[PDB]
Structure 1
Amino acid sequence: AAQTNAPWGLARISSTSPGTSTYYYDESAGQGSCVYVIDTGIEASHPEFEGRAQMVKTYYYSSRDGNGHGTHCAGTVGSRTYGVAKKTQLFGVKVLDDNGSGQYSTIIAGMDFVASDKNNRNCPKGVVASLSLGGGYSSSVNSAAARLQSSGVMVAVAAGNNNADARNYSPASEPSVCTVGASDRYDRRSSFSNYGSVLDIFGPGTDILSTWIGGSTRSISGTSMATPHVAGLAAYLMTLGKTTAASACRYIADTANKGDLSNIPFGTVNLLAYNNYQA
């Protein structure tokens, strides 16, 4: 399948070269997989989600996304126009309030929730969790991310936006999850992207168009935007049977475009997520 005039990040993940604008992908499109977006919520009524999104948990007085960040990330995972895996099921877990803030205790509870809740959901092709959030190092936060991964969920986490080594951030620094840095449309490391040996992969993160609250769209930047590209890619590859939740991060690294990014610090992987789709 081909989506013409796609957002640059979708085109990038299906291309061996920067500078193209069509997204190519197998029409299975993540059908039968599920992606949990652990964030500020998801505006599930957005036409772009086509009934495939739903809120399943909140820790606040409402399950509504009053911020937009979670809706944007969910859109990059799985919206019809802006999403990598256009037929996946999206589940919202609101661990962040409408200012984008959340206590580590709440974030941990949300991860443990997903590890159990996937057993209440029909996801025969596999389960992914996208965590576009984090803060300073916490062994308890890292352990929660490790538990979620061990339970059989592909966990993709944002590296962070401090232009610093991700070893000092959580859950970014948990080795067993998939830690995602950000790149731009010219194949440069995004100016704000964290780096370091704990990174597994880069995805598009500068100037990413996706869904927003109020039934709208906008372009924003962050490792938060790169992470759902990788989460959606994992769901897509799991639906194709090419990999599993336990192996998808390694598979994405194995099949990535290698050596193509600039301003990668020595010791950080030079790997850009790539779907390897051949029509």
Structure 2
Amino acid sequence: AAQTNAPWGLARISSTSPGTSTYYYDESAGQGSCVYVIDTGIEASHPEFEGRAQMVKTYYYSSRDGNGHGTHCAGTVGSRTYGVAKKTQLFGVKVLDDNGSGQYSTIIAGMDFVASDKNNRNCPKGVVASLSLGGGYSSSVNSAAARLQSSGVMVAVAAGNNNADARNYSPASEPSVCTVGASDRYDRRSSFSNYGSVLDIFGPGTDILSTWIGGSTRSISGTSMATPHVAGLAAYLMTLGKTTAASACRYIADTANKGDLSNIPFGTVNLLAYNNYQA
């Protein structure tokens, strides 16, 4: 399949070079897979989701997204126009409030919820979780992310936006999950992106167009925007039978575009997520 005039980030994940505007992908498009978006919620009624999104859990007075951040991340995973995996099922878990903040105990409860809740859903091709959040180092937060991965879920997490070594942030610093940095349309590391030996991969993170609350759209930047490109790619590859939840991070790194990014500090991987689709 071919999507003309796509957002730059979708075109980049299906290309060997920067500067193109068509997204190429196998028409199976993640059907039969599931992606949990653990964030501020999802506006499931947005026309871009076509009935494939629903809220499954909240820790606050409402399950609605009063912020917009979680709706934007879900759109990069699986909306019709702005998503990587256009036929996946999306499940929302609201662990952040409408100001975008949340206690670490609530975030841990949310990750334990997904590890059990997958047994109540129909996901024959496999299960993914997208975590666009983070804070300072916590051994308890890292252990929760490791349990979720062990249970058979592909876990993707944001590196953080401090222009620093990701070793000092959680869940970014957990070894067994997929830690994602951010790049821009000219193949530079984003100026805010964290780095270090704990990173596994980079994805598009500067000026990313996706869905917003109120049935609208907008372009915003961060490692939060890079993370759902990788979660959507994992769902797409599991549907095609190329990999499984336990080895998807290794498969994505083995098949990535190598040595193409600028301003990568010595010691950090120079790997950009790529679907390797041949029309």
Normalised by the length of structure 1, the TM-score is 1.00
Offset from partner CA, 1:157-197 (integer Å, 9 cap, x none): 00000001000000000010000000000000000000000
Shift of 1:206: 0.2
Shift of 1:27: 0.5
Shift of 1:97: 0.5
Partner-residue secondary structure (3-state), 1:36:
strand
Partner-residue secondary structure (3-state), 1:56:
strand
Offset from partner CA, 1:197-217 (integer Å, 9 cap, x none): 000000000000000000000
Shift of 1:232: 0.1
Shift of 1:57: 0.4
Shift of 1:262: 0.4
Structure 1: unaligned runs, 5 residues or longer: none
For residues 134 and 262 of structure 1, what CA distance do their matches in structure 2 show? 25
Shift of 1:145: 0.3
For residues 239 and 251 of structure 1, what CA distance do their matches in structure 2 show? 14
Offset from partner CA, 1:80-114 (integer Å, 9 cap, x none): 00000000000000000011101110000000100
Offset from partner CA, 1:138-160 (integer Å, 9 cap, x none): 00000000000000000000000
Partner-residue secondary structure (3-state), 1:77:
helix
Shift of 1:132: 0.2
For residues 132 and 115 of structure 1, what CA distance do their matches in structure 2 show? 18
Shift of 1:255: 0.3
1:91-110 to 2 correspondences below 5 Å: 91-110=91-110
For residues 245 and 99 of structure 1, what CA distance do their matches in structure 2 show? 32
For residues 149 and 155 of structure 2, what CA distance do their matches in structure 1 show? 6
For residues 122 and 164 of structure 1, what CA distance do their matches in structure 2 show? 40
Match of 1:166 in 2: 166
Match of 2:247 in 1: 247
Partner-residue secondary structure (3-state), 1:163:
coil
For residues 276 and 116 of structure 1, what CA distance do their matches in structure 2 show? 33
Partner-residue secondary structure (3-state), 1:55:
strand
For residues 275 and 102 of structure 1, what CA distance do their matches in structure 2 show? 34
Shift of 1:227: 0.1
Normalised by the length of structure 2, the TM-score is 1.00
Shift of 1:16: 0.5
Match of 2:20 in 1: 20
1:1-279 to 2 correspondences below 5 Å: 1-279=1-279
- Percent of aligned positions that are identical: 100
For residues 155 and 147 of structure 2, what CA distance do their matches in structure 1 show? 10
| Runs of 4+ that moved beyond 4 A | none
Shift of 1:4: 0.4
Partner-residue secondary structure (3-state), 1:38:
strand
Partner-residue secondary structure (3-state), 1:156:
strand
Partner-residue secondary structure (3-state), 1:6:
coil
For residues 275 and 252 of structure 1, what CA distance do their matches in structure 2 show? 8
Shift of 1:233: 0.2
Shift of 1:252: 0.3
CA-based RMSD of the aligned residues comes to 0.4
Structure 2: unaligned runs, 5 residues or longer: none
Q: How many residues align?
A: 279
